[PDB]
């Protein structure tokens, strides 16, 4: 995601405000970042209880694409 | 990692201490830096 962003930035001029494509990249980065943090949280409480860990894992497996689709529809309906 | 399997209590203590000393120190650095470079 960082590689993707770096390649795009060199083309555009040094403007202070946030573009729409930069907003989308920040959304995708926040999603993959929270995925890594969710793994860190599941790994922190893995030896203590496996029930809560498995519950958080199967909750992530259903609620990350739904929230991503919500963000995608809000984005493609506000910027069109 | 070097202190595990020889003194596990010390490794646990320094990982719990560095679990709270790092965000505090980074926040203090952020406050001091932005304060000294926004009021300049």
């Amino acid at each position: 995601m960082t590689t993707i962003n770096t390649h795009l930035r060199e083309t555009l001029p040094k403007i202070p405000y946030v573009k729409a494509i930069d907003m989308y990249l920040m959304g995708c980065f926040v999603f993959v970042f929270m995925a890594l943090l969710e793994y860190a949280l599941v790994n922190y409480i893995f030896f203590s209880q496996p029930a809560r860990a498995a519950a958080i894992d199967r909750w992530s497996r259903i609620f990350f694409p739904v929230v991503f689709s919500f963000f995608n529809i809000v984005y493609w309906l506000y910027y069109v | 990692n070097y202190f595990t399997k020889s003194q596990p209590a010390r490794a646990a203590k320094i990982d719990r201490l560095s679990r709270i000393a790092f965000p505090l120190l980074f926040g203090i650095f952020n406050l001091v830096y932005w304060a000294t470079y926004l009021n300049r």
Binding site: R9, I15, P16, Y17, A40, N43 | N1, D15, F26
Partner: protein
């Protein structure tokens, strides 16, 4: 923005502002191609330069600029903070996962 006379010394050609010095250099409203800075105002002055051929009138104009931080925040200061946070998230993984934290 310093301008003066070439070839005509102070005893030959002198310059002056046609209106009040605060009102002589006029910047237009829609006249700003700045992306990275912010024009705050203008400032004129008048003086004399001492050259090898005589003294010359020099009219000075200063434009005051302030750099906008909005680009450099998103370019460097927010990724640095996020990378430091990504380093600090390694402290929460278990001590039995050595390649992970490595």
């Amino acid at each position: 923005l310093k301008f003066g006379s070439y070839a005509y010394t102070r005893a030959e050609v002198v310059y002056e502002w046609t209106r009040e010095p605060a009102r002589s250099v006029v910047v237009a409203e829609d006249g700003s191609r700045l992306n990275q800075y912010d024009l705050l105002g203008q400032t004129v002055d008048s003086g004399i330069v001492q050259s090898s051929t005589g003294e010359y009138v020099v009219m000075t104009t200063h434009f005051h600029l302030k750099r906008k931080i909005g680009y450099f925040v998103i370019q460097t200061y927010l990724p640095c903070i996020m990378t430091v946070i990504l380093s600090q998230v390694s402290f929460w993984l278990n001590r039995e996962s050595v390649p992970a934290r490595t």
